[PDB]
Ligand binder design. Structure first.
Ligand SMILES: *[C@@H]1O[C@H](CO)[C@@H](O[C@@H]2O[C@H](CO)[C@@H](O)[C@H](O)[C@H]2NC(C)=O)[C@H](O)[C@H]1NC(C)=O
Ligand code: NAG
Ligand code: NAG
Ligand code: NAG
Ligand code: NAG
Ligand code: NAG
Ligand code: NAG
Lengths: 125, 240, 48, 107, 328, 47, 125, 107, 48
């Protein structure tokens, strides 16, 4: 199983940025997707979730309205369109998929992460 | 409460729990997918919630994985013959799931009672130590050769599936034409008389014409019967 | 007649049809055999 | 929103110590926690799921327990590779939330 | 017609007194007990149902204090003379009188029956027939073996034991049991049950089947002069060298493995294939005896699934064989 | 045996255990039918 | 499973001492318990055995009459009352549990040991 | 009393050697030896029970065999940690007794 | 009668009830059917 992310980097405040997460080694179109971000030197923060079919989407409170999660079940790729970026949005952003083992599969847990991509919202040149 | 109880006793002394005078819904037990085995003999599992039972007994104990097959009607095994024996005919359900989560820490609390019980009648709990019995010429001491003390210990370790501990609860139903203490969660309709209606009273079932009766039951009685032992008179549960 | 219960409905209840069929079939052979005897007795008694 | 409070937020221990990492649930979730180990600059790894079931490949010195709102992560014998920040995680309802993290330090 | 634990008709029932200084001795319980007490002053007040009656194990209690009925199943400490002067569990609360009671314990349930017929005959049990309705049922479930009564001390009572007979109960119109016949009381009564009618008219009736029970038992098997030569093999004056292991075939004889088993001169009577006890019981076509001499270490060496000098070079034992190695 | 061709972890295959409560003989259930197992909420995976 | 021994020390010849072995990690009340002693630099010598219920007690030849073994299934503690001590009784005393590894239960065997405690019978100060 | 005599009382050998220790009983006890390994200053460890069954956690090189009166403890290939004192012990009847001990040293 | 063996004592002795009951049931049906025929023959022959 692989989750290769891209799209991170420096963006001017208030502009937009889209991340990508390439999925392989598993049935993408059947597992729900998550974005999780980690600001520099701080703890973990859940960002968003999209269902297997992309009809269901939730977002964290701090990104409501601005962040949109999407899905391409054809190309097996997860995205995060970040809009109205601000300084506190500077974080290392991870993609991950739901996953459950075999036995206690009734209880939904978390699992394998993307390597992460860095997005910095700062006006410096 | 019984199914998700924190601790269950060892098989050699299995606790018997009496269920009566309560409304019981078995959909909840059915719905959970944690249950590894839900094998039911006397009654089909889907219909459990529908039916009425005179009596329910709940038996709880912990056994290794390989032994779960032995807990069955007319099944012969080490633990089946010595520890816990099911009548071939018993109307009930067998519920089993892993205990590695709650147990298997080596765990020696659980005991399974070997040779000391050679043949065992169904549905009795046998806890007698019987110091060293199984087969021997010397007796009644800490003695060695060929006595071999009965209550041997399961050793539960996370290393141990076939040897993994499985919590098993066995439900035995008693079915009879009597006031059923326990019934499923079914609403009661209003009574209709002098009309061909399919009816079940106290889960009795049947089709007939309900009419008021001049015959006077004695206070204890509930069901009347005819010469051919055919149900002809009943006492309405809600209103006597 | 060597079945779990003599009442036919209790067999219709208390278990689903695919297994219950086996129990009912045992009931039928017993009941059908009872008529064979009863009718055959009448014919002989009717002849008398 | 279910709130998860870990106690302590940080701790110092020595190799070989038995250390307990605790998580409290705001409301009963009763068996659902997933424990993760995160080291600086690395993505987290699942250690304990269903609040007591060990994840594949995770060494047995990690052990979990609890039900309702009372849960702990326990290390029988701390190893030098075990010094890290640990998060409890609830999955009863959405949105999923994390404990604030417990940092295991060298004494 | 029903089969249940009933008091056999015309039976012997012990008759204990509450007179002159007298006592209420402990009596054995049974599958059931019949307790009929005759009263003018309502003296009798109690019952006990325990295995031990000494607080070691659970003991059911029934006592009637003035207007209350009490039932408890603790491990009470009963006095040696338990009398009512003028780990705990469930509890319940609420001669001119003959307060008959039938206390039966079945299938983990303890059932009580009752009747209060008024009587003018003080001497003894009145002829008559009163059925007993089920007063109360409660699910105690104890391995009850004993029984004692509690008398108010400043009224004789009878005790009979139920048996598993078959009775024919004659229900009346409104439902009262008016008559019954004990199907095994006497040959006349066997007829009444078989006819299923209380009146039996003139004639001869077939009721039951005589039978002669098999008294002893016999198991047989022919003696034979084909005694196993095992003794000759063990007692041979000279055995061959280990390299030349002599193979002796044994057939067409009865083998007394037990005599070998009981004999203890043999230092090692090791067995892998079959337990020596079953050897006498279990019988095969081919028996092979091998004879040779080795050192003590090699006696260990000659075993299945083993590698060694004697084990491999000159005489090899396969892992699989069913056999026993005997060395002395 | 299918180890030689399959089982490379190979997650391609699907078996649909949880909420498939019953199927009639010779019947295929190809509806994804997001999730039911038992409760009122939806739109998340939940517990 | 743990067996904590105590009660050792220096005793003058002819006096008495009680040794204790605290049991944990298993159901104590169902097993026999053994005492085994080891004289300094010497071999093992079986001392005394008690049945699970304490009704049966057997002692070695050298200690009959003087040594008394006892049991407390409530505290899960094993005791060895030693009396009329003499120079030869100096030994490191072990408490021990019956045990049987598998199904060959017709072996009734020997198993896990306590750490052992030293008893010195001496008039020295 | 049942007397168990070990032979030899001591022996010197090097790593990798095949060793054989014998215990002989005054009377047939027929399967009831128990073999232990004892190191100086620590309590013995059980190796073989019923004279032929290997106890869990003990390496497969340890092997016992025999029944009746003649019994053998065998270590197929010595390693440095196996140099120690080994005792046979009967359980046939009471009083339980030990062999006099067999010390394995380095050659 | 399509059972393992004609002798009742055999099937009882060698096999315990859980399996034997099926075989015993077969002997019962065969024997009981055989008894029906003889009685019905007698009733017919008795009338003649
Ligand atoms: C109820 O307790 C009695 C003892 O008072 C049990 O009777 C014993 O049964 C064993 C059978 O294993 C016999 O060897 C004993 O001799 C019996 N005791 C006496 C005094 O004879 C009885 O078994 C217990 N009930 C049940 C169902 O086990
Ligand atoms: C038989 C039963 O009640 N099983 C329950 C299950 O329904 C529930 O979802 C789970 C939550 O922890 O606990 C267990
Ligand atoms: C069929 C047979 O004889 N099996 C024996 C068994 O009885 C004995 O206990 C065991 C010794 O470990 O050797 C084998
Ligand atoms: C009843 O007791 C008498 C002695 O009082 C005895 O002769 C008689 O045989 C007994 N009858 C029965 C049925 O036990
Ligand atoms: C009768 O006996 C019960 C048994 O405990 C006792 O509690 C009660 O006080 C007594 N008296 C009355 C009047 O119930
Ligand atoms: C109460 O029952 C428990 C059940 O095992 C028992 O251990 C205890 O000894 C009993 N109480 C008394 C006083 O014997
Ligand atoms: C019928 O009931 C009345 C009481 O209303 C009673 O007098 C009569 O005896 C009853 N019949 C029978 C047979 O008991």
């Amino acid at each position: 199983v692989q989750l290769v992310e891209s799209g991170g980097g420096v963006v001017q405040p208030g502009r937009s940025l889209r991340l990508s997460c390439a999925a392989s080694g598993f049935t993408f179109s059947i597992y729900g997707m998550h974005w999780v971000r980690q600001a520099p030197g701080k703890g973990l923060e859940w960002v968003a979730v999209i269902s297997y079919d992309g009809s269901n989407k939730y977002y964290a409170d701090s990104v409501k309205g601005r962040f949109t999660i999407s899905r391409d079940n054809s190309k097996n790729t997860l995205y995060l369109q970040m809009n109205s970026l601000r300084a506190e949005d500077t974080a290392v952003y991870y993609c991950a998929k739901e996953g459950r083992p075999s036995d206690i599969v009734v209880v939904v847990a978390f699992d394998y992460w993307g390597q992460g991509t860095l997005v910095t919202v700062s006006s410096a040149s | 409460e019984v199914f998700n109880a924190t601790r269950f006793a060892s098989v050699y002394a299995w606790n018997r729990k009496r269920i009566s005078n309560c409304v019981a819904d078995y959909s909840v037990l059915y719905n959970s997918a944690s249950f590894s085995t839900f094998k039911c003999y006397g009654v089909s599992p889907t219909k459990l919630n529908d039916l009425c039972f005179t009596n329910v007994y709940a038996d709880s104990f912990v056994i290794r994985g390989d032994e779960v097959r032995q807990i069955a009607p007319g099944q012969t095994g080490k633990i089946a013959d010595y520890n816990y024996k099911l009548p071939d005919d018993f109307t009930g359900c067998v519920i089993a799931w892993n205990s590695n989560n709650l147990d298997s820490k080596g765990n020696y609390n659980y005991l399974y009672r070997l040779f000391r019980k050679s043949n065992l009648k169904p549905f009795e709990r046998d806890i007698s130590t019987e110091i060293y019995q199984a087969g021997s010429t010397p007796c009644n001491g800490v003695e060695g050769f060929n006595c071999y003390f009965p209550l041997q210990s399961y050793g539960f370790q996370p290393t141990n599936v076939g040897y993994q501990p499985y919590r098993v609860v066995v439900l035995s139903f008693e079915l009879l034409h009597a006031p059923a203490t326990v019934c499923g969660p079914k609403k009661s309709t209003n009574l209709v008389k002098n009309k061909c209606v399919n009816f079940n009273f106290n889960g009795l079932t049947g089709t007939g014409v309900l009419t008021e009766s001049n015959k006077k039951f004695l206070p204890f009685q509930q069901f009347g019967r005819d010469i051919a032992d055919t149900t002809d008179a009943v006492r309405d549960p809600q209103t006597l | 007649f060597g079945a779990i219960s003599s009442v036919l409905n209790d067999i219709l209840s208390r278990l689903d049809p695919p297994e219950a069929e086996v129990q009912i079939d045992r009931l039928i052979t017993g009941r059908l055999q009872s008529l064979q005897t009863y009718v055959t007795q009448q014919l002989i008694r009717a002849a008398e | 929103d279910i709130q998860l409070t870990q106690s302590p937020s940080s701790l110092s221990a020595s190799v070989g110590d038995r250390v307990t990492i605790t998580c409290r649930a705001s409301q009963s979730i009763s068996s659902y926690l997933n424990w993760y180990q995160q080291k600086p600059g690395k993505a987290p790894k699942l250690l304990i799921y269903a609040a007591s079931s060990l994840q594949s490949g995770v060494p047995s010195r990690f052990s979990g327990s609890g039900s309702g709102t009372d849960f702990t992560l326990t290390i029988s014998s701390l190893q030098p590779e075990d010094f890290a920040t640990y998060y409890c995680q609830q999955s009863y309802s959405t949105p999923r939330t994390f404990g604030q993290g417990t940092k295991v330090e060298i004494k | 017609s029903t089969q249940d634990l009933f008091l056999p008709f015309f039976s012997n029932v012990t008759w204990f007194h509450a007179i002159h200084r007298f006592d209420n001795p402990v009596l054995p319980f049974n599958d059931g007990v019949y307790f009929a007490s005759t009263e003018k002053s309502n003296i009798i007040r109690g019952w006990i149902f325990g295995t031990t009656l000494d607080s070691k194990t659970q003991s059911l209690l029934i006592v009637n204090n003035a207007t209350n009925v009490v039932i408890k199943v603790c491990e009470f400490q009963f006095c040696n003379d338990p009398f009512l002067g003028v780990n705990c569990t469930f509890e319940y609360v609420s001669f001119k009188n003959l307060r008959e009671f039938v206390f039966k314990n079945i299938d983990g349930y303890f059932k009580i029956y009752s009747k209060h017929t008024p009587i003018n005959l003080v001497r003894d049990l009145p002829q008559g027939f009163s059925a007993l309705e089920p007063l109360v049922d409660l699910p105690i479930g104890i391995n009850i073996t004993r029984f004692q009564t509690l008398l108010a001390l400043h009224a004789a009572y009878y005790v009979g034991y139920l048996q598993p007979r078959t009775f024919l109960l004659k229900y009346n119109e409104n439902g009262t049991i008016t008559d019954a016949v004990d199907c095994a009381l006497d040959p006349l009564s066997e007829t009444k049950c078989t006819l299923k009618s209380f009146t039996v008219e003139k004639g001869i009736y077939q009721t039951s089947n005589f039978r002669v029970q098999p008294t002893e038992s016999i198991v047989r098997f022919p003696n034979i002069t084909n005694l196993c030569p095992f003794g000759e093999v063990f007692n041979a004056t000279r055995f061959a060298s280990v390299y030349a292991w002599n193979r002796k075939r044994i057939s067409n004889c009865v083998a007394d493995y037990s005599v070998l088993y009981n004999s203890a001169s043999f230092s090692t009577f090791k067995c892998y294939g079959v337990s020596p006890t079953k050897l006498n019981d279990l019988c095969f076509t081919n028996v092979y005896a091998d004879s040779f001499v080795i050192r003590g270490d090699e006696v260990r060496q000659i075993a299945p699934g083993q590698t060694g000098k004697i084990a491999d070079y000159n005489y090899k034992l396969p892992d699989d064989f069913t056999g026993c190695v005997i060395a002395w």
